[PDB]
Design a protein around this ligand. Structure first.
Ligand SMILES: [Mg+2]
Length: 461
């Protein structure tokens, strides 16, 4: 009802975005002078539609694309030509810029060479360059349901993304694995590959037809997982979704888990393990990913078991020297496969490329420093992303009031049960004595976007 003037609307907007901490307008209307209260008012007045999310702004996450000049790859740099091998960037349906690709080579005698090719980002982003500094200031690419704000310029992604061009330069990790999964050798080198893009479901279809390299990649991944599990490795693969938002509204799509998705994941793990092995052998400091023992032992792979396990996990800590990763069953590990979207991965590439160029990689001291600096930024970026995903997920829920969702009890707190709706990767508290693992049907009501809360209930129980 209160028709605010333009200047007033903006005043309220600055508060909703967290840029201001007060508002004479809200104060006057007997409304709380809080970002959430300003948000609700803007919705009630029609100034803002339900599509708008204030979380990136509130957390001071960068919403602007990086407008710095991007260097070209050096054509004279010698690279191992692998354009003759079938190579594939296999990703989620709807993905747009590949960081990685996989391939294999039979080496005879039961030995197989696994190739994990990664976008050669460090060839374009040198330590301390304006590109490196801005990427460090962001920590990670911000993937909102309605837009993507890269850690690096769009120009850079367009030129380094694998498979975006007929042939692509890459920084590759190669591991020679015997039938049992033991690595007889690991290498890191600059390459040139011809990559074909496929969604996980499409690679799965090829695996099912017995097509190579899918059949071989699956054999290697299975043997590798069995080895890591033998070393205490345990899973927290809970249901995932794609959250999208556009002109037509919000959408939440369940992410299928074909075997090829698991296989590709294992190839990334092998690549990170090899990278760490390589760095350890050559005394190259990297942001090694470590994880100490969990709070308590939790067995099983059911939803409730994985739900509990995730809560007991020790935090993943990145340090300049190798350390065991309990969750992965590895003695050492480094994330090296997503340099376009994660700053730590880019640092791994910068360190490896420096070594390859016969130069001096950053010392452990500067490494500990850059890890600390980037992580604070990555934390804020990731939180802005998580809040934004929940926002649109609620819009999706609110658009289908009549829908009944399938849920599972994954935890309990008194008379309260935590219900996870897999198709939404969304959980809510609901009164019910149902034991963990119990399948229930739930309906949602009273969605409040500014506060992002909803009331759920077990139906026809
Ligand atoms: Mg990928």
């Amino acid at each position: 009802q209160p028709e605010l003037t333009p200047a007033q609307r903006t005043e309220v907007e600055l508060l909703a975005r967290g840029r201001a901490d007060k508002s004479r307008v809200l104060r006057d209307l007997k409304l709380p002078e809080t970002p959430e209260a300003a948000h609700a008012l803007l919705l009630r007045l029609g100034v803002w539609d339900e599509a708008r999310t204030p979380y990136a702004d509130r957390l001071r996450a960068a919403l602007n694309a990086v407008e710095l000049p991007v260097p070209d790859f050096d054509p004279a740099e010698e690279r191992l030509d692998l354009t003759h091998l079938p190579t594939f960037a296999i990703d989620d349906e709807g993905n747009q810029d590949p960081d990685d690709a996989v391939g294999v080579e039979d080496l005879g005698g039961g030995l197989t060479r696994l190739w994990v090719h990664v976008a050669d980002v460090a060839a374009l982003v040198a330590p301390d360059s304006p590109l490196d500094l801005e990427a460090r200031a962001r920590g990670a690419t911000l993937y909102l349901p309605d837009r993507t704000i890269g850690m690096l310029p769009d120009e850079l992604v367009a030129k380094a993304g694998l498979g975006l061009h007929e042939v692509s330069p890459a920084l590759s990790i190669c591991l020679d694995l015997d039938p049992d999964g033991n690595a007889e050798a690991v290498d890191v080198l600059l390459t040139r590959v011809k990559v074909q893009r496929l969604a996980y479901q499409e690679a799965q279809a090829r695996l099912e037809a017995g097509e190579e390299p899918f059949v071989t990649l699956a054999r290697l991944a299975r043997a590798s997982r069995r080895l890591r599990e033998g070393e205490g490795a345990l899973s927290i693969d809970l249901p995932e979704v794609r959250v999208k938002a556009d002109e037509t509204g919000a959408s939440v799509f369940p992410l299928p888990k074909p075997e090829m998705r698991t296989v590709v994941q294992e190839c990334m793990t092998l690549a990170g393990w090899g990278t760490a092995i390589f760095a350890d052998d050559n005394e190259i400091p990297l942001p090694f990913a470590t994880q100490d023992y969990p709070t308590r032992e939790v067995a099983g792979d059911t939803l409730p078991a994985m739900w509990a396990r995730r809560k007991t996990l020790a935090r993943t800590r990145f340090q300049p020297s190798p350390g065991p990763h309990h969750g992965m069953g590895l003695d050492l590990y480094a994330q090296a496969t997503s340099p376009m979207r994660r700053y730590l991965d880019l640092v791994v590439h910068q360190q490896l490329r420096a070594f390859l160029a016969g130069r001096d990689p950053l010392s452990s001291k500067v490494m500990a420093a850059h890890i600390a600096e980037s992580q604070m930024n990555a934390d804020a970026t990731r939180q802005a992303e998580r809040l934004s995903r929940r926002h649109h997920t609620l819009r999706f829920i609110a658009a289908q009031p009549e829908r009944v969702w399938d849920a599972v009890v994954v935890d309990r707190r008194g008379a309260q049960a935590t219900l996870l709706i897999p198709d939404l990767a969304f959980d809510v508290q609901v009164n019910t004595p149902a034991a963990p693992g119990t399948a229930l049907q739930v309906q949602f009501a009273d969605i409040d976007l500014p506060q992002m809360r909803v009331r759920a209930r077990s139906v026809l129980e």
